[PDB]
């Protein structure tokens, strides 16, 4: 692929990204910065503010867990629509398409969650709410450990200042990972990823002349995302082993079943 083709690929992905994900980083940061004509998000900072704000957005910890799970389920659907737009993806063996989503969806979720985060909290419900980092961390033992690792990642990731156009290609790169366990036919997948990484390299050079080695920095984050999944899974294990009325949504259940 030569530059013109790489640029066309980047725009193709950006447009499908815009059609697949309702809340972009652009909108999100505008809200976070207060640089929108929109009314400021409702702030959830405790149990009272949560119950109270449930008009635009069991025990508290579990209500928050269920809200997050509802959102994850919707995010998986959005990511699946995006994947199907990546040139070459739907021509792959259907079983490999399933594998790539199975492993890729949570990594993408955390990537996009960063767009919604600052060091103080996170936008929820289409950006209509803002749940504080401190509040989440105060959740009783098991539950207070879930979001914090994502905040820590987001703070460092957000320092790279990527925009939606950069992110479109990055997310495609992550989806087209040829080393997912159980792939039937790696070559076609790695071929596509090769094109995407080329498009990403060019995108970052053009869009961020100031960030020397940004490509290299961003590549290292792909591996950070994998560790986040590992830790998250271990925490889900504790919820499974020692919790009351705790059950995952069937889509989440099939994603986590025999994951690694």
């Amino acid at each position: 692929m030569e530059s013109a083709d790489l640029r066309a690929l980047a725009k193709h992905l950006y447009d499908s990204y815009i059609k697949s994900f309702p809340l972009t980083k652009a909108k999100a940061r505008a809200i976070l910065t207060g640089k929108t004509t929109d009314k400021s998000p409702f702030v959830i900072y405790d149990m009272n503010s949560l119950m109270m704000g449930e008009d635009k957005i069991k025990e508290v910890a579990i209500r928050i867990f269920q809200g997050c799970q509802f959102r994850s389920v919707e995010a998986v659907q959005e990511i699946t629509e995006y994947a199907k737009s990546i040139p070459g993806f739907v021509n792959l063996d259907l079983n490999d398409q399933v594998t790539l989503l199975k492993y890729g969806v949570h990594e993408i979720i955390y990537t996009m969650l960063a767009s919604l985060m600052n060091k103080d909290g996170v936008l929820i419900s289409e950006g209509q709410g803002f749940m504080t980092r401190e509040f989440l961390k105060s959740l009783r033992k098991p539950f207070g450990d879930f979001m914090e690792p994502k905040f820590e990642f987001a703070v460092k990731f957000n320092a790279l200042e990527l925009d939606d156009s950069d992110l479109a290609i990055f997310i495609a790169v992550i989806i087209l990972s040829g080393d997912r366990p159980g792939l039937l036919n790696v070559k076609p997948i790695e071929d596509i990823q090769d094109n995407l990484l080329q498009a990403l390299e060019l995108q970052l050079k053009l869009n961020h002349p100031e960030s020397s080695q940004l490509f290299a920095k961003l590549l290292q984050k792909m591996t950070d995302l994998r560790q986040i999944v590992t830790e998250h899974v271990q925490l889900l294990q504790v919820i499974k082993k020692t919790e009351t009325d705790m059950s995952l949504h069937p889509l989440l259940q099939e994603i986590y079943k025999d994951l690694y």
Binding site: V76, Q77, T80, K84, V90, L94, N95, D96, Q97, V98, T99, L101, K102, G182, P250, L251, E254, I255, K257, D258
Partner: peptide, 16 residues
């Protein structure tokens, strides 16, 4: 011998 599509009914459905 159960394929990926066979053990991920929802994802398979989403992909269709």
């Amino acid at each position: 011998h159960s394929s990926l599509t066979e053990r991920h009914k929802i994802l398979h459905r989403l992909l269709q």
